[PDB]
Every structure is written in C-alpha cells, then in structure tokens.
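Lab notebook, bench 4. We co-purified these components, and the gel suggests they stay together. Before we commit to crystallization screens, I want a quick structural picture of the whole thing.
Request: model the full complex, all chains together.
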Amino acid sequence: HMKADEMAHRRYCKRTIPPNYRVDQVFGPRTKGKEGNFGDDKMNEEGIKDGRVTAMLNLVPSSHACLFGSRVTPKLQLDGLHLRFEFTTVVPCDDPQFDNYVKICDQCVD
Amino acid sequence: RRYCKRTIPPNYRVDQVFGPRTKGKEGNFGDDKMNEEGIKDGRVTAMLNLVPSSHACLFGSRVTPKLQLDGLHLRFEFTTVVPCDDPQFDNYVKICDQCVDG
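Here is the predicted assembly.
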C-alpha cells in the first residue's frame, strides 16, 4: 500500500499511476518525438484501465533489466546528474502477440 | 520468461543473467565487483532507486517502436535526473563513475 498522492508525486522515476488516474496527472501530457510521447487520448484518459496498457507493460523492462540490460549513460550536467537508460525490447514476428503489440504502438506512439 | 522481465537471483553474476559487461553497448552498467557480487552488492540497491517503475518507463520515456530484421524493437529512452541536493547524490555519482566506462 502507498498513498495515492505520494504514489503520483514521489520521486518522478518511481511514480506510478493509481487506478482511476490520468497519465498526464502523473507523467505530464503526451508529446511527440520527446519524452512522454507514448499513448493516445483513450489511453491517457483511461490509464491502467485501458487494456492496451496491460499488454504494453509486458514489454517494459523490470528494474534489473532496466539497470543491467539497457545502455546506461550517466552524465553530470549543471542542473544535475543525468542517468539515461536505453532499453530495447525485441518482439519477434512469430510472437503470438506480435500483431497486437504493433497495432498498439502504431496508434499510441507519437 | 521474457528477457525484459528477468531478475537477478541470489548467487548469480549479473553477466550470467544479462550477459558480459560491455563498454558502450547494452549491458554496460556494472564493474567486476558488481558483476560478481550480484544482487548482494549494496551499490546495486542504491542504483535501483534511480531505475524507473514500469509506468514511469512507459509514460515517462521517449518510446520508439521500429520493425527490424528480427521483429519489433520497442525502445525506451528514460532519463532520471538527480539534483545536486539529493541526499544520496554524491553516492550515486561515485557508483556511476565506477560502473561505467565508455
């Protein structure tokens, strides 16, 4: 258990969306070519209630995967330490969910 | 078990789960001590504070899908920024300078 406001206002990288909560109400508005670019309107309005999100989360790396599996680039910039994680999940075409993962990304990624 | 969801269990070397530590490619985080000490290394527990949650990673990242030679490549570029005043800040920097070369 975790308070819902402490859940959406805690350390940005550790934040999570509570049931009945908008994506923008936690990670800002959906953009394009920039961070926070994932998701259309339905998804942003429905949050985890949108079933496409549950599918996509199967593709998100876990904590260790993210840490030891991605290309990590840490660089001290004047505004602070920047820790960039570059993780790439690969879904082979034969994967039973392939089509749907594509359908989702297509409509969500801007 | 989907690769992106694996975890490091006790007595396993990081590289026995996520492969040998490289320089500028994927799987470049971790010095010998970390690779060998696995999840036991306390520095690991520190760093994990900076790794994004499932949600932060989906909605806070710069996501780039791309069909490639071997299937769909869903890329996540997430950047945790740690402010100088962060209680652990310095700690984070030390570990980072240790576990990364390039």
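The helical segments of chain A are 5-8, 24-27, 41-46, 51-57, 63-69, 98-108. Worth comparing against the SEC data before the next meeting. Strands of chain A lie at 71-77, 80-91.
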